Design a binder for this molecule. Structure first.
Ligand SMILES: CCCCCCCCCCCCCCCCCC(=O)OC[C@H](COP(=O)([O-])OCC(O)COP(=O)([O-])OC[C@@H](COC(=O)CCCCCCCCCCCCCCCCC)OC(=O)CCCCCCCCCCCCCCCCC)OC(=O)CCCCCCCCCCCCCCCCC
Ligand SMILES: CCCCCCCCCCCCCCCCCC(=O)OC[C@H](COP(=O)([O-])OCC[N+](C)(C)C)OC(=O)CCCCCCCCCCCCCCCCC
Ligand SMILES: CCCCCCCCCCCCCCCCCC(=O)OC[C@H](COP(=O)(O)OCCN)OC(=O)CCCCCCCCCCCCCCCCC
Ligand SMILES: CCCCCCCCCCCCCCCCCC(=O)OC[C@H](COP(=O)(O)OCCN)OC(=O)CCCCCCCCCCCCCCCCC
Ligand SMILES: CCCCCCCCCCCCCCCCCC(=O)OC[C@H](COP(=O)(O)OCCN)OC(=O)CCCCCCCCCCCCCCCCC
Ligand SMILES: CCCCCCCCCCCCCCCCCC(=O)OC[C@H](COP(=O)(O)OCCN)OC(=O)CCCCCCCCCCCCCCCCC
Lengths: 347, 105, 70, 117, 98, 115, 318, 175, 80
């Protein structure tokens, strides 16, 4: 792609997310989502192979269906309220349709059927854009409509996302599908604490974006897209195995790491509201995520899978890659738990 | 993340199409301008939790201005009872509900 | 010579004169010898419906002047 | 054969300037005529507003004096009960005025302007 | 509410189930997204013209704009499916199943 | 009302010029006169094969430029406003954005046809 | 008595199409050094009646491969949309006085493409397929400038009302402030109405009869009397836009005679162009209305927005 | 039954939606969507939106001409399904029509109905305004306000159309 | 700059006319004295009713009759 056009298209993706974040009018929310989808489609088709075209077709169909349901929720709100302010919704039908639309845009289960497909089809950089930056505009709209979100719907979507994203990653050897089912489980964690304390929703979103950006930057820095090619990293750059070790143990929710920070706080806000069964099932179901994270740490860091002969040539060449903010994101994704009361800045 | 840039910078990007009671072109009122003005001036600043129960009456009048559900239900009752009394023959319509009435102006 | 297209052009010109002349005479016949009232805007329609109400014969074109008042 | 380029462009730009001048004068005259027609409308509007008020109050009283005759056998009916909690005047709906009248008056009053030619 | 909103919401749901149940042909369902845009147009416009909220009268135009501004997007994504494969059948787009 | 009467009249005596075009002459049907036309010879294959469009990028960009005359069309009414320099700036912004779009489609050879 | 007002519209323009066929053939003859029809009637004044009787007693020949419902519905909609674009045209008084009659003309121009389009698809033939998708290439070419030219000329009118376009042109013709728009609109109406050099759908040298190659007589008549109705309506529309005549409200027949003879001169100009110019190729069509007419149309749109503000000559909307 | 004209046009709207939503073929899908978008500019034209109905008619005529060109170029099969060729097309076509006229029958007999919302059964002439707008059609004034009041909406819409052209030319490249 | 202008007028004259007309439409309304009168005509076109004021006692600029000398006048539009 022409880099001026790449700059303009990425600024337009960012502009769509900002127009969703800053606007007080429902039509401008919908315009921001349309602009976001429309601009991110050529980021997915950066390589022009059939898998990117398939991923872009599936992504276009899911996000277009979600935006249709979003605009129908907006028009039913216009009927039952005569106004356009981005606030609570004045009808449970519009509340359900907008919650369905935002759950489709997040790829939360049972609308999850596009996130491993689309994430596998596209490159690692566009997969990073998909799993981090596209989880900011629907979480804005969910942060703004929580007086009208049905409790049973968002909790069913949340625990169904956590369970399905837990079981999905166990059967995977492709790193992008692992990160996609990890995305599904983590969006379930974020939306389960949405009606109890949305500050914990924002905390989980930020810590998740840090850890996911760390993992995709490590994958891009190692040029690995499968488990079995990530397993050659000890013979090429052994510090990267340590970084994926600490980041995957962080993403599993293990103390003393920062990925234990959101989970615990979510439990800390769900037991206040006399819900004991639900965060317990969520915590126990997160052990599946931890299990396929531990599978990746076994294949990469804790053992040494056999490499090839041609790796001896790659010993003679360093990385000329822009590993942008990789030590900063690696430190923030692992050693941030003693700074856990920083979450009050998200109030 | 409602990063309220429009109030921080003082710009009016989309506050003008937000409600019906805003500044309209050529001062055109909506059909529910008074109802929406009463509901917004009731519910201003008291928060949504107090607004859902302390300004319920103005919002019910405004919603029934918008969709006219009670009005159309009452007209259903009046027209259905009128058609029943025509079918039973126990009522005849007046001449000003038939045309021959030499209308007002 | 070239002027033999003029009968066909003349008959075509008559056949194009007929619709405009026809709708002008029909507008003058259906409206009491005057133009058809143009109501592009709802105020013009309100004045026309007021004329229909004040004519007494349920026709907007029947005008009532100062002879109607005392 | 024919003229040069500069002569034809000069004739074209002169035709542009003549058309712009003539349309300038005539559209300014048309705006003055529009303001005259609007001030005639404004001067008529109080009489039309008073007649419109007496018109709609006539029709609502006729719909009210005939509501009590229809609604006599129905138990618990409250004749002329407002559907609004407020006691403010509400502008009447089309069904509130022409709800008891014939379909000719209904069509001519609620689709008359749109369907008119 | 009013009688016409029943059928315009009904047309939205008919086009919804037509979109959301594919008949192995991608153009036949890209028509259904355009029909959902038509139904949303007519529904919002009936609501706006009804209540005389005149400043939102520019809203359906804008809505209609983004209609084709994604429909064209779908057609630009229809031709890449129909250049990789001879047809635009949606069951040819199953490579990302593994 | 008069519009639907006029359209009903036009459709009526457009379909009553067809029902007296089929039912008035004498029909002689045999299965070679109703065959398709390929200049006398039999047509090789069906005409329902995909006839590949060369002007496809122009056809998709027509969908976007046709929206512009849903945006540039209220300009006779937008000129009647009392915030008029703002209207003029936004109008020239829309035609300038259409022109920047057309310039980008020119220079990247999007207006040319394929093959 | 409105039904008579409809029947005094469409029947005199099913006759003006008939004698337009005779005028087309005779002006085409005398510009090609020969004579036209002068055998059937007195100097050809019965040849249209001869063709109109011949076309409706010939065997209609519905094909075996043709999708018959769209095959019959496409000439019905052709003549329907040919007739129904005459109703907002002020002659000086239109049949149906629309507040937005220009956009009715534009939308029914967009709908009349589907008669050609479904006729070319329905008759399952390879030459009628090519003549169908050349209408797509022609319609994505003229429509992208047919609306901005017509926008820019109504920025001096003030509205989309065709009757107000007589009041607009009461001092001067609107061809004097808008002659580039006029000489671009005229070519756009050539490209719209499928007249030469923009035939391109019934392109006889390439495609034997084009989109209606399977339509035998009877249904062929309703594409042949629809296109000519489109050229008479289109030159009346161009006359209303750019050559608006004097209207006396007490003598409408003066306006009717004046715009009638002007629209006849523009129809003779269409016949002059069809008899003198080589026909385009349907990509060179598209590189004309996009590479040439569309940038200058955007420039004149900027100019006709900014110029009534520049001269305090914004026309009224009432 | 002439007071029910917007309701009758809305029945034809739903019939066109069942016509193209059964998905016979995008030829007939474009046919049904033209029929629905042409009666939908008669539904909304009886509410006062004469500008705002002619545009959804005209934009969708251009749209279905483009979609016709693509379904003759890309989405074409040897035997296209008209309305009745497939049993799954005709079955759901008859299903949508019978359910639509079923909820016609339940709303004219009872004058009220409830599918998720509650709907009246009287003709929708009842809800119109009993006043006049003077020398302006108010929807034309509101769409005219897109330039004076809607400046940010102009900026985001024109930017979205610009990058729509750029996005589409970046997709349809192949390399 | 003149040789390139002659070159583009020789090769692509339609685009030269396009950029010339567009440049005039950009710069020329900012250089005209009549652009003020466009706004002054548009805000003196009375669509709505001039809703009167309750006379409190101290409003010297507001008239009591339309034919009074005080108030906004349109003599500038009559002369021009
Ligand atoms: C307001 C909020 C601001 C938030 C921080 C914004 C900046 C950091 C993030 C943006 C980014 O990607 O920066 C690229 C980043 C380099 O990318 P990289 O791949 O991470 O660097 C690898 C090598 O260090 C590259 O080395 P090099 O060969 O290019 O040369 C050395 C380079 C040379 O650079 C320069 O000389 C820069 C000179 C210009 C500076 C700007 C003035 C104009 O200096 C550095 O790289 C120094 C280290 C940069 C650290 C980046 C992260 C900073 C802190 C981020 C937030 C941490 C929060 C923790 C909170 C914990 C509790 C929650 O940093 C810079 O280019 C400059 C950083 C300046 C930091 C300023 C912080 C305060 C701002 C107020
Ligand atoms: C409406 C009433 C009638 C109006 C007049 C119409 C009658 C005359 C019709 C004659 C017969 C035409 C038959 C069809 C012909 C089709 C071909 C054709 O016309 O192609 C168009 C041709 C195309 O030429 P071309 O195809 O050779 O172009 C070459 C292009 N390249 C190099 C890319 C290959 O010309 C145009 O496009 C010009 C259109 C009109 C231009 C109007 C310009 C007005 C003045 C602008 C400003 C100039 C001064 C500079 C600025 C000054 C500022 C102060
Ligand atoms: C509640 C609301 C909170 C909002 C907070 C907003 C904070 C900023 C935005 C964070 C959102 C996610 C940002 C990352 C999006 C993806 C960026 C991307 O993909 O950039 C492309 C680029 C590709 O690298 P390259 O190797 O050159 O590519 C080869 C060819 N593609 O480069 C990469 O892919 C490398 C990764 C670059 C960006 C990673 C660093 C930014 C995000 C990590 C956290 C930083 C800490 C501060 C912010 C905390 C909150 C997120
Ligand atoms: C409640 C849930 C059901 C709602 C719809 C009811 C009718 C449709 C269900 C009948 C079952 C058949 C069916 O629709 O099959 C799916 C079909 C695609 O299947 P296909 O590949 O064409 O055929 C092979 C399999 N039969 O896909 C289609 O036929 C898609 C078209 C559906 C159009 C539905 C319109 C009617 C109104 C629905 C409610 C509003
Ligand atoms: C199976 C394939 C199809 C087979 C059948 C084909 C039938 C014929 C198809 C072609 C005709 C399509 C007509 C589309 C609607 C046109 C609407 C119209 O003419 O509007 C113009 C006009 C606007 O005027 P306005 O600005 O409102 O001024 C009055 C206010 N003082 O409006 C007026 O003046 C208002 C007058 C009343 C308008 C009533 C509402 C419109 C009626 C629509 C009828 C159904 C259209 C069906 C379209 C099918 C398309 C294929
Ligand atoms: C600032 C005012 C507003 C400007 C923006 C608004 C414009 C409105 C008009 C719409 C224009 C839309 C389309 C524009 C496309 C321009 C790009 C282009 O086409 O470049 C190619 C062209 C040469 O064509 P070619 O490369 O051969 O193309 C293949 C076919 N032959 O290349 C060329 O022809 C050369 C183009 C560059 C030089 C043009 C010089 C014109 C000067 C006119 C006088 C000065 C006007 C004031 C503005 C400053 C201009 C520098």
């Amino acid at each position: 792609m022409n880099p001026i056009i790449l700059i303009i298209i990425l600024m337009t993706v960012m502009l769509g997310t900002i127009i969703v974040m800053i606007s007080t009018h429902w039509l401008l929310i919908w315009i921001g989502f349309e602009m976001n989808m429309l601009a991110i489609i050529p980021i997915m088709m950066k390589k022009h192979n059939p898998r990117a075209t398939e991923a872009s077709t599936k992504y276009f169909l899911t996000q277009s269906t979600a935006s249709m349901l979003l605009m129908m929720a907006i028009i039913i709100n216009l009927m039952f309220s005569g106004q356009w302010t981005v606030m609570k919704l004045f009808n449970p039908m519009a509340s359900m349709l907008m919650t369905m639309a935002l759950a489709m845009k997040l790829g939360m289960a049972p609308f999850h059927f596009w996130v491993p497909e689309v994430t596998q089809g596209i490159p690692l950089s566009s997969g990073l854009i998909l799993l981090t930056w596209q989880k900011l505009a629907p979480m804005s709209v969910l942060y703004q409509i929580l007086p009208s979100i049905n409790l049973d719907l968002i909790l069913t979507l949340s625990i169904l996302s956590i369970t399905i994203g837990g079981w999905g990653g166990l059967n995977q050897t492709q790193l992008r599908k692992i990160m996609a089912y990890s995305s599904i489980a983590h969006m379930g964690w974020m939306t389960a604490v949405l009606l109890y304390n949305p500050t914990m929703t924002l905390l989980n979103l930020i810590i998740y974006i840090i850890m996911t950006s760390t993992m995709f930057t490590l994958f891009m820095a190692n040029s690995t897209t499968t488990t079995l090619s990530l397993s050659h990293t000890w013979n090429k750059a052994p510090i990267m195995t340590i970084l994926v070790l600490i980041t995957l143990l962080s993403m599993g929710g293990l103390p003393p790491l920062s990925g234990f920070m959101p989970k615990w706080m979510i439990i800390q806000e769900m037991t206040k509201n006399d819900s004991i069964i639900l965060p317990t099932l969520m915590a126990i179901t997160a052990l599946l995520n931890l299990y396929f994270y531990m599978r990746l740490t076994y294949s990469t860091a804790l053992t040494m899978f056999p490499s090839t002969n041609n790796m001896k040539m790659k010993w003679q060449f360093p990385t000329t890659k822009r590993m942008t903010l990789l030590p900063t994101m690696t430190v923030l994704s692992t050693m941030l738990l003693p700074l856990t009361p920083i979450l009050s800045i998200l109030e | 993340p409602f990063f309220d840039v429009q109030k921080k910078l003082g710009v009016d990007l989309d506050h003008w199409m937000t409600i019906q009671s805003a500044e309209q072109p050529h001062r055109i009122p909506a059909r529910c301008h008074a109802f929406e003005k009463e509901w917004i001036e009731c519910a201003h600043g008291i928060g949504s939790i107090r607004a859902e129960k302390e300004c319920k009456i103005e919002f019910e009048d405004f919603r029934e201005c918008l969709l006219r559900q009670k009005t159309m239900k009452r007209l259903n009752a009046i027209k259905r009872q009128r058609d029943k009394l025509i079918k039973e023959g126990k009522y005849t319509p007046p001449p000003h509900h038939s045309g021959q009435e030499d209308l007002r102006p | 010579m070239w002027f033999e297209v003029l009968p066909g052009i003349a008959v075509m010109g008559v056949c194009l004169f007929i619709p405009g002349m026809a709708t002008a005479r029909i507008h003058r016949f259906s409206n009491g010898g005057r133009e058809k009232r143009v109501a592009h805007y709802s105020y013009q329609w309100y004045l026309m419906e007021r004329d229909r109400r004040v004519s007494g014969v349920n026709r907007y074109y029947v005008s009532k002047g100062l002879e109607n008042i005392d | 054969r024919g003229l040069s380029g500069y002569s034809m462009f000069a004739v074209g730009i002169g035709a542009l300037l003549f058309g712009y001048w003539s349309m300038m004068r005539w559209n300014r005259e048309r705006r003055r005529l529009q303001i005259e027609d609007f001030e005639a409308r404004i001067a008529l509007m109080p009489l039309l507003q008073a007649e419109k008020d007496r018109r709609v109050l006539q029709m609502l009283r006729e719909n009210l004096e005939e509501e009590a005759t229809i609604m006599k056998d129905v138990p618990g009916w409250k004749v002329g009960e407002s559907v609004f909690h407020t006691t403010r005047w509400v502008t009447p709906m089309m069904g509130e005025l022409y709800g008891l009248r014939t379909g000719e008056e209904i069509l001519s009053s609620t689709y008359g302007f749109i369907w008119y030619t | 509410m009013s009688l016409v909103y029943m059928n315009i919401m009904m047309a939205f749901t008919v086009s919804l189930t037509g979109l959301l149940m594919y008949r192995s042909h991608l153009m036949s369902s890209l028509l259904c997204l355009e029909g959902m845009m038509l139904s949303l147009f007519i529904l919002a416009t009936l609501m706006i013209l009804n209540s005389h909220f005149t400043l939102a009268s520019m809203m359906p135009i804008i809505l209609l704009v983004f209609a084709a501004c994604e429909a064209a997007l779908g057609l630009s994504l229809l031709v890449m499916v129909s250049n990789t494969y001879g047809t635009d059948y949606v069951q040819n787009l199953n490579l990302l199943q593994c | 009302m008069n519009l639907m009467i006029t359209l009903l009249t036009n459709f009526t005596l457009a379909t009553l010029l067809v029902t007296i075009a089929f039912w008035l002459p004498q029909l002689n049907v045999y299965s070679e006169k109703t065959s398709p036309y390929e200049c006398g010879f039999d047509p090789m294959g069906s005409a329902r094969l995909p006839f590949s469009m060369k002007f496809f990028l122009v056809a998709i960009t027509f969908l976007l430029f046709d929206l512009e005359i849903a945006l540039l069309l209220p300009l006779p009414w937008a000129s009647q406003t009392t915030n008029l320099n703002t209207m003029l700036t936004m109008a020239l912004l829309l035609i300038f954005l259409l022109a920047v779009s057309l310039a980008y489609e020119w220079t990247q050879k999007g207006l040319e046809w394929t093959e | 008595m409105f039904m008579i007002n409809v029947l005094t519209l469409i029947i005199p323009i099913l006759l003006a199409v008939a004698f337009l066929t005779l005028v087309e053939r005779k002006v085409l003859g005398y510009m090609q050094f020969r004579k036209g029809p002068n055998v059937v009637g007195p100097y050809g004044l019965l040849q249209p009646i001869a063709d109109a009787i011949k076309l409706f007693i010939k065997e209609p020949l519905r094909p075996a491969t043709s999708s018959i419902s769209m095959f019959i519905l496409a000439p019905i909609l052709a003549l329907t949309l040919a007739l129904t674009m005459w109703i907002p045209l002020p002659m000086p008084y239109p049949l149906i006085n629309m507040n937005l009659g220009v956009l009715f003309m534009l939308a029914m121009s967009s709908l009349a493409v589907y008669s050609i389009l479904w006729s070319g698809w329905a008759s399952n033939s390879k030459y009628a397929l090519i003549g169908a998708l050349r209408a797509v290439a022609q319609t994505i070419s003229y429509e992208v400038t047919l609306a901005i030219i017509l926008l820019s000329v109504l920025l001096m009118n003030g509205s989309f009302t065709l009757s107000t376009l007589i009041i607009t042109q009461e001092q001067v013709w609107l061809i004097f402030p808008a002659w580039p728009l006029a000489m671009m609109w005229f070519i756009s109406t050539l490209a719209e109405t499928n007249r030469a050099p923009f035939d391109l759908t019934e392109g006889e040298s390439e495609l034997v009869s084009g989109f209606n190659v399977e339509y035998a007589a009877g249904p062929f008549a309703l594409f042949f009397m629809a296109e000519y109705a489109n050229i008479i309506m289109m030159n009346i529309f161009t006359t209303t836009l750019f050559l608006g005549a004097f209207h006396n409200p007490y003598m409408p027949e003066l306006y009717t005679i004046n715009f009638t003879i002007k629209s006849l001169l523009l129809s003779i100009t269409f016949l002059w162009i069809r008899a003198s110019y080589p026909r385009f190729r349907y990509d060179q069509l598209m590189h004309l209305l996009w590479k040439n007419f569309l940038p200058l149309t955007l420039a004149l749109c900027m100019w006709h927005v900014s110029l009534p503000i520049l001269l305090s000559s914004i026309p009224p909307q009432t | 039954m002439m007071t029910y004209i917007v309701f009758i046009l809305s029945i034809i709207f739903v019939m066109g939606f069942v016509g193209f939503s059964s998905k016979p073929s995008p030829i007939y899908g474009g046919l049904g969507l033209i029929v629905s978008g042409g009666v939908g500019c008669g539904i909304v034209l009886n509410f006062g939106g004469s500008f705002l109905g002619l545009m959804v008619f005209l934009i969708y005529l251009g749209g279905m001409m483009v979609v016709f060109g693509y379904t003759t170029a890309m989405a074409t099969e040897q035997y296209p399904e008209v309305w009745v060729s497939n049993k799954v097309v005709l079955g759901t076509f008859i299903t949508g029509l019978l359910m639509e006229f079923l909820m016609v029958y339940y709303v004219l007999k009872d004058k009220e109905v409830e599918i998720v919302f509650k709907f009246n059964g009287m003709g929708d002439w009842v809800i119109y305004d009993t006043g006049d707008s003077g020398f302006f059609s108010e929807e034309a004034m509101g769409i005219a306000a897109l330039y004076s009041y809607g400046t940010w909406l102009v900026i985001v819409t024109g930017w979205s159309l610009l990058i729509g052209v750029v996005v589409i030319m970046e997709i349809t490249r192949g390399n | 700059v003149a040789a390139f202008l002659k070159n583009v007028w020789a090769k692509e004259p339609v685009l030269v006319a396009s950029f010339a007309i567009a440049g005039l439409a950009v710069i020329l309304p900012t250089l005209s004295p009549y652009t003020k009168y466009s706004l002054m005509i548009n805000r003196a076109t009375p669509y709505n009713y001039p809703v009167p004021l309750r006379d409190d006692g101290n409003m010297p600029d507001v008239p009591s009759h339309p034919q009074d000398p005080q108030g906004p006048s349109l003599e500038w539009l009559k002369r021009l």
